[PDB]
Design a protein around this ligand. Structure first.
Ligand SMILES: Nc1c(C(=O)O)cc(Nc2ccc(Nc3ccccc3)c(C(=O)O)c2)c2c1C(=O)c1ccccc1C2=O
Ligand SMILES: Nc1c(C(=O)O)cc(Nc2ccc(Nc3ccccc3)c(C(=O)O)c2)c2c1C(=O)c1ccccc1C2=O
Ligand SMILES: Nc1c(C(=O)O)cc(Nc2ccc(Nc3ccccc3)c(C(=O)O)c2)c2c1C(=O)c1ccccc1C2=O
Ligand SMILES: *[C@@H]1O[C@H](CO)[C@@H](O[C@@H]2O[C@H](CO)[C@@H](O)[C@H](O)[C@H]2NC(C)=O)[C@H](O)[C@H]1NC(C)=O
Ligand SMILES: *[C@@H]1O[C@H](CO)[C@@H](O[C@@H]2O[C@H](CO)[C@@H](O)[C@H](O)[C@H]2NC(C)=O)[C@H](O)[C@H]1NC(C)=O
Ligand SMILES: *[C@@H]1O[C@H](CO)[C@@H](O[C@@H]2O[C@H](CO)[C@@H](O)[C@H](O)[C@H]2NC(C)=O)[C@H](O)[C@H]1NC(C)=O
Ligand SMILES: *[C@@H]1O[C@H](CO)[C@@H](O)[C@H](O)[C@H]1NC(C)=O
Ligand SMILES: *[C@@H]1O[C@H](CO)[C@@H](O)[C@H](O)[C@H]1NC(C)=O
Ligand SMILES: *[C@@H]1O[C@H](CO)[C@@H](O)[C@H](O)[C@H]1NC(C)=O
Lengths: 303, 303, 303
């Protein structure tokens, strides 16, 4: 038993290589407030997915903080301890610490509540993120569906395969949603269910944003059949909620847009967009018997 | 013969590792209609490539469907069987299926031709994609040229190399275009020829969009010379045309832009951009003799 | 000694696999000119980082060439030797070479200095890049800081780890900046220091743009402790300055924006943005003892 079995279980036979992959992704679903005889911006795939595509990944804008009607000028910093001031002292004029968004004048200017903060020359008013809004603005996004289409290639063979298996069909695929118990190959996932299979609740993760991984895992013993090489799915949170132990901000990005009247009087407005980012983290290795390399590997065992 | 030859052919000697890579890409070429004394938007690299860069990849906008002059409001759905209606029945008021772009009122509203469809509260009018325009709008894109610049690094060595080989020169590189028979190292490819070397015709693939892979393949026996480690090129289609057997849509994306008068009356306009996406799918393994690890590997053979 | 030691040093024991990774990046810092009682656009993270995110990578806009107030029409080509003309000859009417941005009329039109160039139908005036401005416009970017947050996963284990090590804390992390001699684990790098650790000077590399790699390298003997698996950092230039020996342009991209009056009279303006691109090139392999696969590998040694 021993000698044959150990090589046969271990697979020193089968020649193996790691997988070359390509991906495309779409989100589908709509969100709204009010109805007929009324107006409120209805949300679709052309709004909430920006940027429209990324390599192996996509974003969903779950919650938004709005910075409005800016010009460049003079205003107070936000009340945070590292430059809350009784009077000017460490806030050196003509200097700007790496946390900041503007340059000191040397003045501890008055500000409401806590009675003063250090001044900055900056875009004004400053960005305030002291209270990330709750509930998360795009609360309806839990129900949206992500389509993950993936093609795998093995350079050690003429082989390739598409994650939409060769027996899935139109009238099913227009309404299937993935479930590991009943539909192990439908390429469509429901965003709330991506996060729930990772053990987190989308109700909360949507507030401050985060990063989410669809681990499309490929592993094939290519000896059997092309009909029998198959994908398996798993889901992982990739940020972490270790606050005060710290991690810098929960995942977000801070794009802006900018405008003028005909007379040229500039403004920016800035969106601190909090969201969940979905990374389609494909990985695989696959093996095929192949006698030539096997004879060497098993040859060490044959001695 | 046997014992030495099998190890010598197989390369249990040579120590090997898989490649760390970076890429940059530009497209060059122009497209037009009309001439002097006339006006029609002339197309260049600043228009047709959007988004301007992506990781290991780029897009070319071959064909465009235009959704115009929108507001949020009340309008019919497109005539497709899953909600063509004789009268209201399954189209439940206050509900929206995952195919859709708006919410039911419960009314099977009249619409022209096929006499009715279910209503949605939505962006209106709805997106129509029942007839992807032919010939493809940017027909001239077949002649455009993509420059692929790639640098490879092997962490098991101090080694790196640039795919623009160390003997290519200015006056050649300003006009070379790749051909596997005569110019195996020119970094410039012609888009129509990328697709033709994959066996497809750009004349048709430009209509409904798709995904295309430049497999820049590196494989070196580093023992020989740095002058003799070299890239090899190959081209693969990565989407598939298995319609009715289905694949969801052919590759496209659906960005939009949005506007107001000074009085604030909003619009969007939405581009369903169909195109070819080019993925610069670099992969390599390379090997160098190295006596220390060889002595172990060949040691199993020496027994 | 020999038999045990060679297997024990070489690590045919320990089972090993290559790493699955995710990344997020932010830049922080500000740049300015003039002060109070004066106006000049102040620069922050919402301006200079565009595009707002990319997979494993980010851009910093170090230097900008401006193409202004365009319409489509008739104008001369830039004075470059491959179509500087004494009179019309090779510049065939209705043809456009792959270097160009417009189509020949067959006329060698007059132009100032060198007295003529071939005409193009084009966007006009043409893009001029004959003198990349010096010093680089965003000179202050040397002082900006990039935060690199990286999570690693090993599919051969339940294992994962975050590059912000489990003993880094808030009040340090709000002001640490990386240095291989004193702070080997702070996730924040200073852009000028990224380039200086690669041996180049940011003072010059900022002029014509280029590509820069933060090689976050993971290598763990997982036997020891999760507390003792640790990242190591290194920095590499990935473009090259081999001019005249050539490389096509130094790294840049050429986005544009476009506008109309209410009457619809179109313009574009085009930014040839030169910058440094930062690629967070994570790679790792890690090994853990594991007796089952070891017994096979060492079994060849035991014979
Ligand atoms: N320009 C803008 C502007 C603006 O300038 O008004 C406002 C924006 N939000 C927004 C948020 C709430 C809104 N109302 C509202 C909601 C609840 C109760 C009562 C009233 C309304 C609106 O009433 O329209 C508009 C955005 C952008 C973007 O540009 C933008 C770009 C990309 C993604 C998202 C956005 C975005 O959210
Ligand atoms: N805003 C717009 C607008 C608009 O608002 O008019 C129109 C657009 N197309 C378009 C198409 C055809 C056009 N004429 C035409 C062609 C044949 C025969 C007769 C007449 C004309 C035009 O005559 O100018 C314009 C686009 C955008 C984008 O924003 C845009 C953004 C990114 C990529 C592409 C586009 C785009 O194609
Ligand atoms: N639209 C624009 C426009 C415009 O239309 O005026 C001008 C732009 N530059 C710019 C450069 C210099 C400026 N002054 C100045 C500097 C030194 C001495 C004296 C005067 C001023 C300004 O005075 O404001 C403005 C940009 C954009 C973008 O759209 C843009 C988009 C993304 C990144 C960068 C840019 C950008 O640099
Ligand atoms: C496509 O055909 C295959 C045939 O094997 C179906 O396979 C499923 O395989 C998993 C194990 O990998 C089983 O747990 C399931 O029970 C199988 N399905 C069924 C219906 O028994 C696959 O399901 C087929 N595709 C569809 C859409 O059913
Ligand atoms: C750069 O130098 C090399 C020297 O080997 C040229 O190599 C070509 O190599 C392939 C095989 O890999 C041969 O089929 C070609 O015939 C070789 N070229 C020639 C001209 O014979 C390479 O072509 C050189 N670069 C250029 C631009 O010619
Ligand atoms: C977190 O704890 C570790 C404990 O090992 C600190 O480890 C540093 O490890 C390197 C070698 O990898 C040594 O050269 C350093 O001297 C160690 N640091 C010190 C302070 O001695 C690590 O530095 C700790 N984190 C912080 C922020 O200090
Ligand atoms: C900006 O805010 C002011 C009031 O603070 C308002 O008058 C102005 O119209 C706003 N700008 C725009 C473009 O809405
Ligand atoms: C939108 O269409 C209407 C006619 O349906 C037209 O009057 C209006 O000017 C259009 N809007 C714009 C901004 O062109
Ligand atoms: C474009 O330039 C002309 C002068 O050449 C100027 O009159 C016009 O106002 C400029 N356009 C804009 C929108 O500034």
């Amino acid at each position: 038993y021993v000698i044959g079995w150990v090589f046969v279980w271990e697979k020193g036979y089968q020649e193996t290589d790691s997988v070359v992959s390509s991906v495309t992704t779409k989100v589908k679903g709509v969100a709204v407030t009010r109805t007929s005889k009324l107006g409120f911006r209805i949300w679709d795939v052309a709004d909430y997915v920006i940027p429209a595509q990324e390599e192996n990944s996509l974003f969903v804008m779950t919650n938004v903080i709005l910075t409005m009607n800016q010009t460049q000028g003079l205003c107070p910093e936000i009340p945070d301890a590292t430059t809350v001031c009784k009077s000017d002292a460490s806030c050196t004029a003509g200097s700007a610490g790496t946390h900041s968004n503007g340059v000191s004048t040397g003045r501890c200017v008055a500000f409401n509540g806590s009675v003063k903060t250090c001044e900055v020359a900056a875009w004004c008013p400053v960005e305030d993120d002291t209270h990330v809004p709750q509930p998360a603005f795009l609360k309806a996004a839990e129900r949206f569906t992500l389509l993950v289409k993936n093609n795998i290639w093995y350079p050690k063979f003429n082989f390739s395969k598409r994650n939409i298996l060769p027996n899935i069909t139109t009238t099913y695929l227009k309404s299937c949603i993935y479930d590991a118990k009943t539909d192990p190959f439908c390429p469509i996932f429901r965003l709330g269910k991506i996060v729930e299979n990772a053990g987190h609740s989308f109700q909360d993760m949507a507030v401050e944003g985060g990063i989410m991984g669809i681990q499309v895992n490929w592993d094939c013993n290519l000896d059997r059949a092309a009909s029998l090489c198959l994908p398996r799915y798993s889901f992982r949170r990739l940020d972490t909620r270790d606050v005060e132990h710290n991690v810098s901000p929960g995942y977000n990005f801070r794009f802006a847009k900018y405008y003028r009247d005909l007379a040229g009087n500039t403004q920016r407005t800035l969106i601190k967009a909090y969201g969940i980012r979905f990374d389609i983290i494909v990985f695989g290795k696959a093996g095929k018997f192949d006698i030539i390399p096997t004879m060497i590997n098993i040859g060490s065992g044959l001695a």
